């Protein structure tokens with residue numbers, strides 16, 4: 001999962017630290033979780 | 049929707065397609081969808 005998430009992360013923007021405002025949906029199904037939505041966001045940047 | 053390739057259209061018995069849907073398939077790096085009322089929002093999962 002960890003490898004694939006960053007593979008999808010750079011499959012759209014490249015390796016040159018560009019970003020895309022298109023989210024990445026992911027669903028973890030487990031008996032140990034609620035029906036929760038955790039929105040991880042990219043770090044805020046001031047200079048390109 | 050089968051010509052598009054991805055299931056994102058209302059399909060059921062009776063009257064379902066009750067409003068003219070002007071789809072525009074366009075080309076970009078990765079897939080999402082945007083309406084003209086949820087401006088800014090980027091729908092990504094086709095159930096939604």
Ligand SMILES: Nc1nc2c(ncn2[C@@H]2O[C@H](COP(=O)(O)OP(=O)(O)CP(=O)(O)O)[C@@H](O)[C@H]2O)c(=O)[nH]1
Pocket residue numbers: 058059060061062063064065066
């Ligand atoms: N067995 C079977 N069912 C089909 C086939 N094609 C469509 N159906 C069924 O027709 C019903 C409605 O499908 P749909 O394409 O949404 O019709 P529609 O054109 O949107 C109805 P309207 O245009 O009036 O709003 C569905 O239940 C679908 O399963 C088919 O080839 N075989």
Ligand SMILES: [Mg+2]
Pocket residue numbers: 064065066
């Ligand atoms: Mg219809």
